[PDB]
């Protein structure tokens, strides 16, 4: 089981495609699940996601024209109950206490959110929080040096290894973080 976590592409509003090297890495038949935080913001990007994996889950971003996407989603992948939301709903934006408030509501082991365009992966109160950032590296008013990034989760029973891919200059660079459920 491995899960691609990405979002805030903002195509065509702020970007026109994923960077060159990301389109090369992201190709069919390698990834089982995709959890997407939203702001695609169109079918052209959706249908591209639909040919990367069978099971693709998407929540509604603030600029998605599609209403059929739910506000939030909880899905289970192995032992982890995972929570998905775009994060424009979480006020103040990117606030820890508000994000944990939302973890208690869904009752999830991992919370994925993405309104900030800023990658974050960390444990807090024995519970895990992912923000994949913007996979296109899209403009945000509140953060000026946006690094194009996505996340690959490698789930095995009661453990998760999250890998963060980042486009720094021309180079794709990877870091790894590991969370075990109590």
């Amino acid at each position: 089981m491995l899960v691609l976590v990405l979002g805030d592409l903002h195509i065509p509003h702020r970007c026109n495609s994923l960077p060159a090297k990301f389109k090369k890495l992201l190709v069919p038949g390698k990834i089982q699940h995709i959890l997407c935080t939203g702001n695609l913001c169109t079918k052209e990007s959706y249908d591209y996601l639909k040919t990367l994996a069978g099971d693709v889950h998407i929540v509604r971003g603030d600029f998605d024209e599609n209403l059929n996407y739910p506000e939030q989603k909880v899905v289970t992948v192995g032992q982890f109950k995972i929570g998905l939301i775009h994060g424009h709903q979480v006020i103040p934006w990117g606030d820890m206490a508000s994000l944990a408030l939302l973890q208690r509501q869904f009752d999830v082991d991992i919370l994925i959110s993405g309104h900030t365009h800023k990658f974050e992966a960390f444990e807090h109160e024995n519970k895990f929080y992912i923000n994949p950032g913007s996979a296109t590296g899209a403009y945000n008013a509140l953060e000026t040096n946006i690094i194009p990034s996505f996340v690959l989760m490698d789930i095995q029973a009661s453990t998760v290894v999250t890998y963060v891919y980042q486009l720094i200059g021309d180079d794709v660079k990877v870091e790894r973080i590991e969370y075990k459920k109590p």
Binding site: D154, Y163, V174, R176
Partner: peptide, 12 residues
């Protein structure tokens, strides 16, 4: 510890 930019990654 570094990792390759591949899917999935591998170690150095």
């Amino acid at each position: 510890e570094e990792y390759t930019p591949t899917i999935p990654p591998k170690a150095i």
